[PDB]
Ligand binder design. Structure first.
Ligand SMILES: CC(C)(N)CNCCO
Length: 132
């Protein structure tokens, strides 16, 4: 089936993706059928970026699990780009619902999800970010 090339990451997975020119950006691994384009080349994954909803063919080597958060979260880009803050929100919101986490503005709503993420996604850890 699709994405069976002996590489990491399958459909539904929350990831950081690295496009030349940009900070690591949050994405979801999607099937090529959702993209309205074509099958990915071997060793690549279609992702849909949080915040803008666009599609990219990205190598599996330029993707890491979103759960490795503090390692790829980019504090500078977060302070500089409103689009990145926007992206964080939609990314973390999706993570929250998956992990069965709940929290009590925008920057104000982001704050505890950001802390949860940076803190290691407690109590479930990264296990709680899986699809299904
Ligand atoms: C998602 C990209 C293409 N890596 C950057 N998008 C910036 C505007 O949201």
């Amino acid at each position: 089936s699709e994405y069976q090339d002996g590489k990491e990451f399958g459909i539904g997975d929350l990831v950081w993706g690295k496009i030349k020119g940009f900070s690591w950006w949050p994405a979801m691994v999607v099937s090529w059928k959702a993209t309205s384009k074509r099958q990915a080349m071997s060793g690549m994954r279609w992702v849909q970026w949080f915040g803008d909803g666009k599609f990219s063919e990205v190598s599996a080597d330029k993707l890491v699990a979103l759960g490795l958060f503090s390692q790829h979260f980019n504090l500078a880009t977060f302070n500089k780009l409103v689009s990145y803050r926007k992206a964080m929100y939609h990314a973390l919101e999706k993570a929250r619902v998956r992990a069965g986490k709940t929290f009590p503005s925008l920057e104000d709503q982001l704050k505890p999800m950001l802390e949860w993420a940076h803190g290691g996604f407690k109590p479930t850890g990264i296990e709680g970010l899986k699809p299904n």
